[PDB]
Amino acid sequence: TARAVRGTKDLFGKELRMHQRIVATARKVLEAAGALELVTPIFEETQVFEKGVGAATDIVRKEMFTFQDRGGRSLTLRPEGTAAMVRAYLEHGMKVWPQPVRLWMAGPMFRAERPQKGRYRQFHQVNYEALGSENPILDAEAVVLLYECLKELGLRRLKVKLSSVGDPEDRARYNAYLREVLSPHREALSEDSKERLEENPMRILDSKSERDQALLKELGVRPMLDFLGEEARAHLKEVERHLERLSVPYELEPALVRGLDYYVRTAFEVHHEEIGAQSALGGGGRYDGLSELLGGPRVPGVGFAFGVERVALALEAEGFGLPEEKGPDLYLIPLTEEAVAEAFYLAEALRPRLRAEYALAPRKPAKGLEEALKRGAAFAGFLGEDELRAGEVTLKRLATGEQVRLSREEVPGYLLQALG
Amino acid sequence: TARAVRGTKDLFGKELRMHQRIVATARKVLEAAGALELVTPIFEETQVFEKGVGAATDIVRKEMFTFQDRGGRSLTLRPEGTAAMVRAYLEHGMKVWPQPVRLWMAGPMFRAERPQKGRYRQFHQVNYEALGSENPILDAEAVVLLYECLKELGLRRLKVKLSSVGDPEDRARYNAYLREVLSPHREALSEDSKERLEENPMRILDSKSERDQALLKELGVRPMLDFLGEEARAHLKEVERHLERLSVPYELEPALVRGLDYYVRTAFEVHHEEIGAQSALGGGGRYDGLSELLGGPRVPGVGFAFGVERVALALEAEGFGLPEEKGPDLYLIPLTEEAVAEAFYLAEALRPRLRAEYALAPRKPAKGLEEALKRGAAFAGFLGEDELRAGEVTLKRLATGEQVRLSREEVPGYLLQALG
Ligand SMILES: Nc1ncnc2c1ncn2[C@@H]1O[C@H](COP(=O)([O-])OC(=O)[C@@H]([NH3+])Cc2c[nH]cn2)[C@@H](O)[C@H]1O
Numbered sequence: 001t002a003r004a005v006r007g008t009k010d011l012f013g014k015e016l017r018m019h020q021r022i023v024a025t026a027r028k029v030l031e032a033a034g035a036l037e038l039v040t041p042i043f044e045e046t047q048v049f050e051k052g053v054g055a056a057t058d059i060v061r062k063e064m065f066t067f068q069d070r071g072g073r074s075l076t077l078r079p080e081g082t083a084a085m086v087r088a089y090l091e092h093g094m095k096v097w098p099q100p101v102r103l104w105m106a107g108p109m110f111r112a113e114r115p116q117k118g119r120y121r122q123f124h125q126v127n128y129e130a131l132g133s134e135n136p137i138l139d140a141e142a143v144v145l146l147y148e149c150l151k152e153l154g155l156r157r158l159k160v161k162l163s164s165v166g167d168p169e170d171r172a173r174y175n176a177y178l179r180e181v182l183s184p185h186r187e188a189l190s191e192d193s194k195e196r197l198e199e200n201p202m203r204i205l206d207s208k209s210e211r212d213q214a215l216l217k218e219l220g221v222r223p224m225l226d227f228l229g230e231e232a233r234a235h236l237k238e239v240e241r242h243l244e245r246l247s248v249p250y251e252l253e254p255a256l257v258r259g260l261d262y263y264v265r266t267a268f269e270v271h272h273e274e275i276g277a278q279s280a281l282g283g284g285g286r287y288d289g290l291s292e293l294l295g296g297p298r299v300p301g302v303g304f305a306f307g308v309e310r311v312a313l314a315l316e317a318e319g320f321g322l323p324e325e326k327g328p329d330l331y332l333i334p335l336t337e338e339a340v341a342e343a344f345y346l347a348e349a350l351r352p353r354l355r356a357e358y359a360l361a362p363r364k365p366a367k368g369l370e371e372a373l374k375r376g377a378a379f380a381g382f383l384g385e386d387e388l389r390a391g392e393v394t395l396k397r398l399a400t401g402e403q404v405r406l407s408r409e410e411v412p413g414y415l416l417q418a419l420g
Numbered sequence: 421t422a423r424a425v426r427g428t429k430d431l432f433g434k435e436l437r438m439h440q441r442i443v444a445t446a447r448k449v450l451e452a453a454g455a456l457e458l459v460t461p462i463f464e465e466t467q468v469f470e471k472g473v474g475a476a477t478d479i480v481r482k483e484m485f486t487f488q489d490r491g492g493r494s495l496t497l498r499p500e501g502t503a504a505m506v507r508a509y510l511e512h513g514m515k516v517w518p519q520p521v522r523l524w525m526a527g528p529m530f531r532a533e534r535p536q537k538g539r540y541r542q543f544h545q546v547n548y549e550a551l552g553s554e555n556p557i558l559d560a561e562a563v564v565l566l567y568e569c570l571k572e573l574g575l576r577r578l579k580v581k582l583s584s585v586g587d588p589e590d591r592a593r594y595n596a597y598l599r600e601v602l603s604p605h606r607e608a609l610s611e612d613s614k615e616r617l618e619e620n621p622m623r624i625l626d627s628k629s630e631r632d633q634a635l636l637k638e639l640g641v642r643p644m645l646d647f648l649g650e651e652a653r654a655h656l657k658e659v660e661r662h663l664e665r666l667s668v669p670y671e672l673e674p675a676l677v678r679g680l681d682y683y684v685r686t687a688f689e690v691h692h693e694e695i696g697a698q699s700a701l702g703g704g705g706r707y708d709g710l711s712e713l714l715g716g717p718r719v720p721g722v723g724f725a726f727g728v729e730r731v732a733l734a735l736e737a738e739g740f741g742l743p744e745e746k747g748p749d750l751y752l753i754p755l756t757e758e759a760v761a762e763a764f765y766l767a768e769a770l771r772p773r774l775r776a777e778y779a780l781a782p783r784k785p786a787k788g789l790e791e792a793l794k795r796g797a798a799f800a801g802f803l804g805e806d807e808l809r810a811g812e813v814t815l816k817r818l819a820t821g822e823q824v825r826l827s828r829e830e831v832p833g834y835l836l837q838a839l840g
Pocket residue numbers: 079080081082083111118119120121123124125127128129259260280281282283284285286287302303304305306307308309310
């Protein structure tokens with residue numbers, strides 16, 4: 001009856017392997033930069049996400065799998081990693097390790113939103129963090145690292161997008177501006193936008209429908225960029241300077257609306273055309289102050305996170321495939337009932353250095369050979385009355401048909417030199 | 421303010437690495453046996469665990485982190501893997517694959533129980549499964565595989581415990597027996613046991629408190645073993661025969677009541693008497709019928725699962741340690757403010773083939789050298805005015821103190837041949 005809940009799925013075969021390759025590569029580039037692996041629990045006290053992600057965001061307001069611990073305390077299934085990483089930084093007094101403290105991990109994230117192509121309820125993302133410094137070099141580095149992770153995978157058609165939100169103050173002022181300009185024309189907005197106009201109006205910029213877009217154009221709504229505080233623009237230029245020097249092709253966006261409210265200054269996202277909607281492979285930005293929201297000292301930080309699934313789609317789109325599932329090195333086929341147990345014993349002697357499988361019932365040579373082929377076995381091994389009594393085994397390389405009769409002892413050696 | 425919820429913790433450093441080693445080894449032995457990796461979602465429809473694990477077990481009754489879908493469906497945080505593996509088997513129609521279908525994975529499990537030493541609310545376990553056959557060879561194999569995973573890790577002081585719970589009929593008869601013997605003495609049972617007496621009385625055997633144990637002893641409650649039917653007894657002997665042949669040292673336990681109700685016939689556990697309470701490194705058994713509980717055809721199956729944390733404790737107990745975390749190949753130290761950015765640029769040119777780190781502020785040679793040593797860097801690199809203008813870098817192997825001045829171009833080559 002039961003099925004895997006909509007939005008989640010079982011990972012196996014090629015799909016699983018691709019995920020493992022993605023994380024493998026990310027592990028290399030990130031750790032090369034001095035990043036330390038740190039894995040946080042699947043759930044945190046609900047507050048860590050409420051206060052951190054911001055009580056006004058969609059995530060916090062209606063996309064968090066939150067439940068109560070038996071007795072008391074409200075816990076929530078981690079929807080994003082940053083807040084957690086900061087929580088960990090505080091808890092372990094990482095503030096005393098040599099700065100900056102770079103952390104990374106790869107794991108599942110849970111968002112209670114209606115699934116569609118690209119939007120899963122349970123997805124997996126690689127997360128990078130650089131805590132303890134305001135220096136714009138880390139911001140550039142963050143962007144470069146994300147860019148490299150996808151680059152190393154073989155992806156070529158990426159679109160990097162940089163921008164800044166200035167700061168909470170600048171953010172507030174832009175919002176007020178949008179309200180003053182849009183409110184008198186409120187009646188021309190899409191129902192969706194009309195709501196967004198109340199809390200965090202910026203969203204109306206990144207909304208759909210022609211109604212909104214045409215209006216924004218005629219009204220001559222000026223970019224968030226024009227509202228950046230000076231020091232903010234200085235910092236952003238530093239980042240650009242570094243990116244340009246490192247030859248990282250990017251496009252400066254008029255405004256990047258990131259789904260999380262803890263962002264301050266730097267904001268970026270890498271996209272891929274070959275995905276349709278949800279072209280965002282990954283995203284990130286600076287988030288100073290978050291630590292304080294969780295009740296800790298001021299700890300500056302930058303970082304990113306990319307969806308492994310999205311990246312997988314991108315790779316597939318660009319014609320990147322994976323090679324066939326390897327079969328057993330040897331598949332033992334019992335010709336007599338007494339042989340089945342003996343096949344098992346032989347198999348165990350070959351393991352784990354050699355992958356040896358066997359049938360659990362006696363069968364005709366042709367049939368067992370059929371199954372060995374059916375399992376992509378390199379060698380087929382026959383165990384009948386003759387070999388059992390002789391303490392030998394009849395091996396047969398399936399690719400050529402070459403057959404050899406040898407003692408049980410030689411089998412490991414023969415197979416290894418013939419396949420290694 | 422916030423902390424990692426009690427029962428969970430952040431995995432990093434040596435602790436994290438040990439877990440990775442444990443899973444690494446398990447992956448080898450299991451896949452050598454022909455096991456395929458299959459990862460199920462963190463949560464399933466609450467029913468999968470209610471019906472599967474059995475509505476009478478502690479797990480289902482009061483240890484499941486269950487919550488509601490953002491729109492109805494009751495979901496539960498996976499407390500154990502078998503039921504899920506079976507659910508997956510059914511869903512993907514694995515029944516049409518060549519039998520038996522062996523599956524494995526490693527991941528977090530969540531149990532809402534009060535934590536103590538060894539009992540975490542979020543733990544991780546390696547899970548093995550063999551579906552599609554009743555043949556006792558798989559049961560022996562299962563025990564051998566679990567034994568091998570721990571053996572390969574270097575563990576020597578293990579205690580394998582084998583037993584059986586019989587068939588549904590035998591199971592029923594033993595229950596009736598327990599009721600008849602215990603009911604007239606019902607008043608001497610722990611509140612917990614009094615409930616268990618109603619459905620699946622066997623649990624009262626594996627309960628805690630002195631109240632229950634002393635009573636069971638004086639009442640002379642006979643082991644589940646004495647109630648095995650003919651066929652069950654036959655099957656168990658087959659397993660023993662195989663284990664004995666493979667020289668797997670085990671002890672036949674009188675009553676090995678397992679913590680799950682889906683078990684039928686074979687039941688085993690491996691323990692280590694150096695972890696204190698909760699010595700069970702791992703456990704498993706046969707569970708035919710479970711598939712049917714989930715509304716599917718009859719699918720026989722055997723398997724096990726061991727707690728990575730417990731295994732880690734065991735290894736530690738046996739004096740198994742982990743070596744030193746590798747440091748950066750090169751640590752660039754800026755001597756001027758203009759140098760910091762240049763250090764970053766140089767580092768990025770060396771990455772990812774070479775692990776290059778750097779300081780984010782100018783400092784005295786001696787100080788930067790100390791930091792390079794602190795970080796376990798192989799080579800220290802100086803970037804002062806001279807080298808900046810000369811397009812060179814001053815490298816110094818922290819080991820021999822050998823200092824070299826060379827152009828930025830030669831650096832990658834020099835470092836690689838001197839460390840590879
Ligand atoms: N529903 C979904 N289905 C599939 N994939 C998804 C889904 N939602 C998010 N992702 C993936 O996670 C990536 C980053 O998500 P985010 O932009 O919310 O960032 C963050 O989470 C921040 N914590 C990043 C960060 C780290 N430090 C600073 N910022 C997206 O590019 C996307 O590929």
